[PDB]
Amino acid sequence: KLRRECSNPTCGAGVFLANHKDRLYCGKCHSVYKVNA
RNA sequence: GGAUUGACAGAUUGAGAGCUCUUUCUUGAUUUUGUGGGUGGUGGUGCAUGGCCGUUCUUAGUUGGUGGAGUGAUUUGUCUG
Ligand SMILES: [Zn+2]
Numbered sequence A: 001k002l003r004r005e006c007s008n009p010t011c012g013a014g015v016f017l018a019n020h021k022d023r024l025y026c027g028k029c030h031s032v033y034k035v036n037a
Numbered sequence B: 001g002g003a004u005u006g007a008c009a010g011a012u013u014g015a016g017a018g019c020u021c022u023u024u025c026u027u028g029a030u031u032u033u034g035u036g037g038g039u040g041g042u043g044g045u046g047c048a049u050g051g052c053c054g055u056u057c058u059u060a061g062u063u064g065g066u067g068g069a070g071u072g073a074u075u076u077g078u079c080u081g
Helices: none
Strands: A017-020 A023-026
Touching: none
Parallel strands: none
Antiparallel strands: A017 A023
16 A cells, blocks of 8 residues: 555554655644655 | 635735735634624713712701691791890
């Protein structure tokens, strides 16, 4: 499967990642969990 | 394969205000917009009004009960010192 899973410690590695310019944004939370890669 | 709804990177504003936008994940089923239909307004209405306050006012005023006077208003009591 494409559309990357995340390393979310509040989830079971299933939340998708909003790919931006230098951002896989976790939308599960409001603002936090902005792991930059 | 999207009601409400949140944001970082940045023009953004006064903001380290995601509010709008490049954004794209999900926090999400709870009426998100019109009609019904509240609630608020420190909005006009104390000239529509509750209480309360002030003034008429430290000058003392007020009145039923039987009786008199008139016919009825009204008086007499409540007035000459
Ligand atoms: Zn994350």
